[PDB]
Design a protein around this nucleic acid. Sequence first.
RNA 1: CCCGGCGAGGGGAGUGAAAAAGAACCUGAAACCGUGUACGUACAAGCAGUGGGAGCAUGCUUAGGCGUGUGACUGCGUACC
RNA 2: UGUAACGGGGCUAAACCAUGCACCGAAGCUGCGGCAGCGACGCUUAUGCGUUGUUGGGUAGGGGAGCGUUCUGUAAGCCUGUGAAGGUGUACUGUGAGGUAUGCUGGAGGUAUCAGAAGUGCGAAUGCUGACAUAAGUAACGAUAAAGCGGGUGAAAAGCCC
Lengths: 115, 150, 55, 109, 102, 141
Amino acid sequence: ARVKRGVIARARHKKILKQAKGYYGARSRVYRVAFQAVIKAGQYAYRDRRQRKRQFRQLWIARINAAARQNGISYSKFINGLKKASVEIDRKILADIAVFDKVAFTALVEKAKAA
Amino acid sequence: VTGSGKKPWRQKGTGRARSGSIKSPIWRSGGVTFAARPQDHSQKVNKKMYRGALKSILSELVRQDRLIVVEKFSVEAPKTKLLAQKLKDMALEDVLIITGELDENLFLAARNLHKVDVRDATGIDPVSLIAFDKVVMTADAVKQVEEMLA
Amino acid sequence: AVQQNKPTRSKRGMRRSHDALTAVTSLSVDKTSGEKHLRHHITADGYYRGRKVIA
Amino acid sequence: METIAKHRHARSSAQKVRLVADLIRGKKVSQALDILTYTNKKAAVLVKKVLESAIANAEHNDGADIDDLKVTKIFVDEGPSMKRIMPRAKGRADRILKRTSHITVVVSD
Amino acid sequence: MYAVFQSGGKQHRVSEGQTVRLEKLDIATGETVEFAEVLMIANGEEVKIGVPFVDGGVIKAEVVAHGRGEKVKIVKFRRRKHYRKQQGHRQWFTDVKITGIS
Amino acid sequence: MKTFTAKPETVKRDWYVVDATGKTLGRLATELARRLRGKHKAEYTPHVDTGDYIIVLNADKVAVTGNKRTDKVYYHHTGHIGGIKQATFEEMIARRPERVIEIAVKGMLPKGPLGRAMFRKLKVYAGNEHNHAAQQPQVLD
RNA sequence: CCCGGCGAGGGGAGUGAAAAAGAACCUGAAACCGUGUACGUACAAGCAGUGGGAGCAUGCUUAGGCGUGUGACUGCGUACC
RNA sequence: UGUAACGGGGCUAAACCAUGCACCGAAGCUGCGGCAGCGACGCUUAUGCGUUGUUGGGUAGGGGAGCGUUCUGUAAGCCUGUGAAGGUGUACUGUGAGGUAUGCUGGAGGUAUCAGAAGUGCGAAUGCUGACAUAAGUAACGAUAAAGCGGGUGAAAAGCCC
Ligand SMILES: [Mg+2]
Ligand SMILES: [Mg+2]
Ligand SMILES: [Mg+2]
Ligand SMILES: [Mg+2]
Ligand SMILES: [Mg+2]
Ligand SMILES: [Mg+2]
Ligand SMILES: [Mg+2]
Ligand SMILES: [Mg+2]
Ligand SMILES: [Mg+2]
Ligand SMILES: [Mg+2]
Ligand SMILES: [Mg+2]
Ligand SMILES: [Mg+2]
Ligand SMILES: [Mg+2]
Ligand SMILES: [Mg+2]
Ligand SMILES: [Mg+2]
Ligand SMILES: [Mg+2]
Ligand SMILES: [Mg+2]
Ligand SMILES: [Mg+2]
Ligand SMILES: [Mg+2]
Ligand SMILES: [Mg+2]
Ligand SMILES: [Mg+2]
Ligand SMILES: [Mg+2]
Ligand SMILES: [Mg+2]
Ligand SMILES: [Mg+2]
Ligand SMILES: [Mg+2]
Ligand SMILES: [Mg+2]
Ligand SMILES: [Mg+2]
Ligand SMILES: [Mg+2]
Ligand SMILES: [Mg+2]
Ligand SMILES: [Mg+2]
Ligand SMILES: [Mg+2]
Ligand SMILES: [Mg+2]
Ligand SMILES: [Mg+2]
Ligand SMILES: [Mg+2]
Ligand SMILES: [Mg+2]
Ligand SMILES: [Mg+2]
Ligand SMILES: [Mg+2]
Ligand SMILES: [Mg+2]
Ligand SMILES: [Mg+2]
Ligand SMILES: [Mg+2]
Ligand SMILES: [Mg+2]
Ligand SMILES: [Mg+2]
Ligand SMILES: [Mg+2]
Ligand SMILES: [Mg+2]
Ligand SMILES: [Mg+2]
Ligand SMILES: [Mg+2]
Ligand SMILES: [Mg+2]
Ligand SMILES: [Mg+2]
Ligand SMILES: [Mg+2]
Ligand SMILES: [Mg+2]
Ligand SMILES: [Mg+2]
Ligand SMILES: [Mg+2]
Ligand SMILES: [Mg+2]
Ligand SMILES: [Mg+2]
Ligand SMILES: [Mg+2]
Ligand SMILES: [Mg+2]
Ligand SMILES: [Mg+2]
Ligand SMILES: [Mg+2]
Ligand SMILES: [Mg+2]
Ligand SMILES: [Mg+2]
Ligand SMILES: [Mg+2]
Ligand SMILES: [Mg+2]
Ligand SMILES: [Mg+2]
Ligand SMILES: [Mg+2]
Ligand SMILES: [Mg+2]
Ligand SMILES: [Mg+2]
Ligand SMILES: [Mg+2]
Ligand SMILES: [Mg+2]
Ligand SMILES: [Mg+2]
Ligand SMILES: [Mg+2]
Ligand SMILES: [Mg+2]
Ligand SMILES: [Mg+2]
Ligand SMILES: [Mg+2]
Ligand SMILES: [Mg+2]
Ligand SMILES: [Mg+2]
Ligand SMILES: [Mg+2]
Ligand SMILES: [Mg+2]
Ligand SMILES: [Mg+2]
Ligand SMILES: [Mg+2]
Ligand SMILES: [Mg+2]
Ligand SMILES: [Mg+2]
Ligand SMILES: [Mg+2]
Ligand SMILES: [Mg+2]
Ligand SMILES: [Mg+2]
Ligand SMILES: [Mg+2]
Ligand SMILES: [Mg+2]
Ligand SMILES: [Mg+2]
Ligand SMILES: [Mg+2]
Ligand SMILES: [Mg+2]
Ligand SMILES: [Mg+2]
Ligand SMILES: [Mg+2]
Ligand SMILES: [Mg+2]
Ligand SMILES: [Mg+2]
Ligand SMILES: [Mg+2]
Ligand SMILES: [Mg+2]
Ligand SMILES: [Mg+2]
Ligand SMILES: [Mg+2]
Ligand SMILES: [Mg+2]
Ligand SMILES: [Mg+2]
Ligand SMILES: [Mg+2]
Ligand SMILES: [Mg+2]
Ligand SMILES: [Mg+2]
Ligand SMILES: [Mg+2]
Ligand SMILES: [Mg+2]
Ligand SMILES: [Mg+2]
Ligand SMILES: [Mg+2]
Ligand SMILES: [Mg+2]
Ligand SMILES: [Mg+2]
Ligand SMILES: [Mg+2]
Ligand SMILES: [Mg+2]
Ligand SMILES: [Mg+2]
Ligand SMILES: [Mg+2]
Ligand SMILES: [Mg+2]
Ligand SMILES: [Mg+2]
Ligand SMILES: [Mg+2]
Ligand SMILES: [Mg+2]
Ligand SMILES: [Mg+2]
Ligand SMILES: [Mg+2]
Ligand SMILES: [Mg+2]
């Protein structure tokens, strides 16, 4: 039984060309070029799920270090002051409190000052 | 494939992929790498396995009640009209009417009917006993098939 | 000689940006006949500055 | 009304006719007919005859009135290319392509 | 009004009323939950500290949904070594609406 | 929750003055480059120019430790056949005193559109007088 | 009938269920080449993506939030065989 | 070819040596979900698990369990002009190959389930055939013996006619 394979291949190319939609030049238009870009996009996607977590931590820590030094304490002594006062609050929130409720934040630095 | 064995162009020199013939399967219009040959797909079955299978399937019809055993089963004259009418009383449609004494009257009367098939008790098959929705066996045919299968 | 690898639609476009030719936008009007023509050129009928030039 | 008229299989490449077809775009028919009189190109004559047709096309059949008419959509598409051999030095042959264009003009109001 | 609490191995700055998506809880589709892991409460001043959790603070919430997130494709590809992998993933979540910052 | 990020429209940029008389070049430039970037601010975002406008007046009078007043060279190529132009720290202040703080800050900032954008905010000056009196640029140390 | 060279080619009318079934004639993909709409784009360096992300443009129901297109700026990032 | 022997800015401390608590820091460890492979387990039972510890990077390669395609049997059945296949969008869905439903186009075939057989899946082979790009509106328009003007016909004339 001869299997003509024009139907299945086109669907496979078309599936990937849909994933490459948005890219510049032949990387969107041309399967042979797109398929590389779609894979590399996956390689980078797999990687940057790990880096998202790193960058945001740095981003929070910068905000906390910024907001603490306004009150007169450096980040290193602040987190140690919180850890010595056995405070479980994370960077994500400390950075969020630091931006939004500074009148709130002040008390955390004043608590870190005690320890 | 029809053609010459001559190289379309020489080995080196020309800036093209080295070719040996027009007939090569990577080319168009000649090759088909592993061309098929007229082959015999029929396969061996052991006597005991063929008998065992018939004994297995023919026994399951007794459970499912597809095996409708009967006495004398024969149409009056060689006519389909009578056979089609007489199955309505018997409450059948898709059947394998097995008989010991194969009547030409009954045979000729069941060619044109699609869902009916008339086979001799000697010539029963595995696929047929499975396929058809009921199986009408004659008392003589049961006695023959009993002796045949054993 | 010879390109190392092919230019794009973009480049090809970027080169052609200047190939677009301009219109005249400066048609005259003959004093007598009121026919349109190019400046300092004669008309289709054969006029130039409200005077008959060629039959 | 839109009133399309078009030269199909026009013996000129898209590229060359598209150069003229950019002059006329969203311009008044009377103004557009003048330009192509004094555009020094072959494609000017080729595109003019389509527009000059399209206006009569529009006036007779459908819309009428020559005054309120603008070339809304004018575009050229690459048509069939007819292949020709042109023999070069040292025996090698070169496939010349005589290109054609589908000139379309839409004269709306 | 806002308060902080730990849930799916991680904490959430939440206000009274708003919806919050968090990690899957072993709970029915429209029952309720009480978080006694409240880290912080804010209003006029701050009811912080308590070592891990406050003292008599409980965040009461109601379960909204029990759905799955966006499909995250995972493509591991070693260049040059005849190897690539394909793997989808849909993380389970539980949307909860807060109804009491005590 | 998706974290807060500063919005270029909503950013409220402040003005400052820093008298650079008798200051250490690098330790001035560092503190300048800290503020210019917008680090000190609690709403810091690396992709938005959150930092403040700074005026650095009396740039010519900036101090340097060791032998670097003579020893410190400022190399630059002219983009030419063999044109490598050098100039010592004395000779730099002798001609263009604004360049010293400029160059000392520029290197400490990031490199890119935003890096160049956050340099624009710095306003170095040789003389004590500054023409930015309109913004009420308060004193910073 | 209309335009054009008593042309090519079109536009109407008319046949037909249908004429983007009109003879270059079922279906009509992709490469490739256009026309128009939304955003971005002329101080900015590199496999052109990827995580972050303002604005702007469009939809839905609500009197508050989402999806889609776009992607200023920015961390990482040297194609496949 | 250019500073060019801290990665740079820059520093008499932002160097060195010695101590001291801090903090950052990886896919490492812990936290909370989710999946799978084994070995034990109360002994369930023909396997779900109160479990239960444990792994789970991977080229050559070896061992498992699947997706899909054209064809044959189930099928003179079932779905289909109240719109098949194919084409093209959209929204769900599975751990993957994929699958489901539907808008437009298309205008007549398609095929559940469980079996069977394969011309069964392509990005590369200076692959083979057709189509289309690029260079590019670039070179060139084939002897440097030479054209100029008038009139004619024609929609139009440097080239045709006189
Ligand atoms: Mg076939
Ligand atoms: Mg996009
Ligand atoms: Mg997208
Ligand atoms: Mg290309
Ligand atoms: Mg496309
Ligand atoms: Mg990597
Ligand atoms: Mg980590
Ligand atoms: Mg020979
Ligand atoms: Mg060779
Ligand atoms: Mg070659
Ligand atoms: Mg072949
Ligand atoms: Mg042939
Ligand atoms: Mg053949
Ligand atoms: Mg065999
Ligand atoms: Mg039947
Ligand atoms: Mg017959
Ligand atoms: Mg026996
Ligand atoms: Mg025997
Ligand atoms: Mg190359
Ligand atoms: Mg040009
Ligand atoms: Mg245009
Ligand atoms: Mg020639
Ligand atoms: Mg030649
Ligand atoms: Mg020859
Ligand atoms: Mg659990
Ligand atoms: Mg010199
Ligand atoms: Mg950098
Ligand atoms: Mg700006
Ligand atoms: Mg006429
Ligand atoms: Mg006429
Ligand atoms: Mg004629
Ligand atoms: Mg025709
Ligand atoms: Mg005609
Ligand atoms: Mg018609
Ligand atoms: Mg009429
Ligand atoms: Mg009508
Ligand atoms: Mg009709
Ligand atoms: Mg009709
Ligand atoms: Mg139609
Ligand atoms: Mg129809
Ligand atoms: Mg029609
Ligand atoms: Mg019609
Ligand atoms: Mg239509
Ligand atoms: Mg129509
Ligand atoms: Mg037909
Ligand atoms: Mg067709
Ligand atoms: Mg098409
Ligand atoms: Mg197409
Ligand atoms: Mg536009
Ligand atoms: Mg715009
Ligand atoms: Mg704009
Ligand atoms: Mg400049
Ligand atoms: Mg700009
Ligand atoms: Mg560049
Ligand atoms: Mg880069
Ligand atoms: Mg890019
Ligand atoms: Mg992206
Ligand atoms: Mg993203
Ligand atoms: Mg966002
Ligand atoms: Mg995003
Ligand atoms: Mg908007
Ligand atoms: Mg709206
Ligand atoms: Mg960047
Ligand atoms: Mg990098
Ligand atoms: Mg030197
Ligand atoms: Mg050095
Ligand atoms: Mg260093
Ligand atoms: Mg140190
Ligand atoms: Mg030490
Ligand atoms: Mg681990
Ligand atoms: Mg776990
Ligand atoms: Mg043990
Ligand atoms: Mg366990
Ligand atoms: Mg493995
Ligand atoms: Mg199976
Ligand atoms: Mg299937
Ligand atoms: Mg199939
Ligand atoms: Mg079949
Ligand atoms: Mg049959
Ligand atoms: Mg039939
Ligand atoms: Mg039927
Ligand atoms: Mg019937
Ligand atoms: Mg048959
Ligand atoms: Mg179906
Ligand atoms: Mg329908
Ligand atoms: Mg339909
Ligand atoms: Mg379909
Ligand atoms: Mg399935
Ligand atoms: Mg299926
Ligand atoms: Mg259906
Ligand atoms: Mg359908
Ligand atoms: Mg048929
Ligand atoms: Mg079929
Ligand atoms: Mg099918
Ligand atoms: Mg079947
Ligand atoms: Mg069915
Ligand atoms: Mg099914
Ligand atoms: Mg079934
Ligand atoms: Mg094959
Ligand atoms: Mg291919
Ligand atoms: Mg391969
Ligand atoms: Mg063909
Ligand atoms: Mg040209
Ligand atoms: Mg060139
Ligand atoms: Mg050119
Ligand atoms: Mg040239
Ligand atoms: Mg030339
Ligand atoms: Mg010649
Ligand atoms: Mg020559
Ligand atoms: Mg000669
Ligand atoms: Mg001579
Ligand atoms: Mg005449
Ligand atoms: Mg004649
Ligand atoms: Mg005449
Ligand atoms: Mg004539
Ligand atoms: Mg005449
Ligand atoms: Mg005339
Ligand atoms: Mg003449
Ligand atoms: Mg001549």
